[model samples]
Target chain A: DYLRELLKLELQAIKQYREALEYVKLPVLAKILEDEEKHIEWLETILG
Target chain B: DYLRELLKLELQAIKQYREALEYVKLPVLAKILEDEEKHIEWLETILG
Candidate 1:
């Protein structure tokens, strides 16, 4: 229950941030997206 | 020039994520928001 909701949040964040990058060519935005993978990394680490 | 853009994106992220937290109260979202702090921590560490 806890992580499921957390996972949902991560996906949503990634989605929004991803959209932010689609039109904007900001590397910082890209880097933020990069950090997101690490979030998923930690999230998935426990999910499995 | 690069870090300036990065800083912009992070603030934008904090703004959107902060909005996300306003109506929805998910701890996962909260923790993710927490991680944004770390992102800024690293960003600011280099800026200063």
Candidate 2:
């Protein structure tokens, strides 16, 4: 169902964003980190 | 028994946190939000 959406997003984010982390500059890295936080928040909200 | 208890606690805390959100004010409200966030995180960690 829609709960599956959270898992899909987490897998995608964890794959893409984590790879981007190594190469990004500080400001960009900060933005990505914030995005990760939002992703985690949404996942925790739905899955919990 | 442990898993059932965990589920009960999670549901109870979620209900309480949502009710608190409706009634609470600023700085203390922020703390409550943070605690709720942490609770969700802990629940995810356990479930995962």
Candidate 3:
């Protein structure tokens, strides 16, 4: 049950980072999303 | 299920933006998190 909650929350994190890039247009947001993408990448590497 | 999906993802968005501010020592990430706070404010206004 440990990775369960972690995996669930991380899935939502990935979706948020990806979908949020659609509406926001600030360069700051762009950099933030880049780190977010790194988060997703690490999550995948750990889980899969 | 319209607001449902949006709200669910938004929950994670708030978490992501806030937590992202922790290791981020740049003005860009700061400003982006500030804007994210705006997003959550509006969401709360509409749904609450």
Look at candidate 1 and give me any clashing residue pairs.
none
Over the stretch A1-43, how does candidate 1's per-residue lDDT look in tens digits?
4555555655666776677678766676677788787778766
Model 3 clashing-pair count: 0
Ten contiguous residues with the weakest lDDT in model 2 chain A: A1-10
lDDT of 1: 0.67
lDDT of 2 at A46: 49
Task: Kindly provide the TM-score obtained by chain B of candidate 1 when compared with the true chain B.
Answer: 0.83
> Candidate 1 at A39: error in angstroms?
4.5
lDDT of 2 at A16: 51
Cα-based lDDT at residue A4, candidate 2: 52
The C-alpha lDDT values of all candidates are: 0.67, 0.48, 0.52
Best by TM-score: 1
**Fnat, one value per model:** 0.12, 0.00, 0.00
Over the stretch B1-48, how does candidate 2's per-residue lDDT look in tens digits? 332343354455446545645664435434434644654564465465
DockQ of each: 0.15, 0.03, 0.08
Would you estimate the TM-scores of all the predictions?
0.53, 0.36, 0.42
Best by DockQ: 1
Model 2's alpha-carbon lDDT is 0.48
| The candidate that achieves the highest lDDT relative to the unseen native structure | 1
Give lDDT: candidate 1, residue A38.
Answer: 73
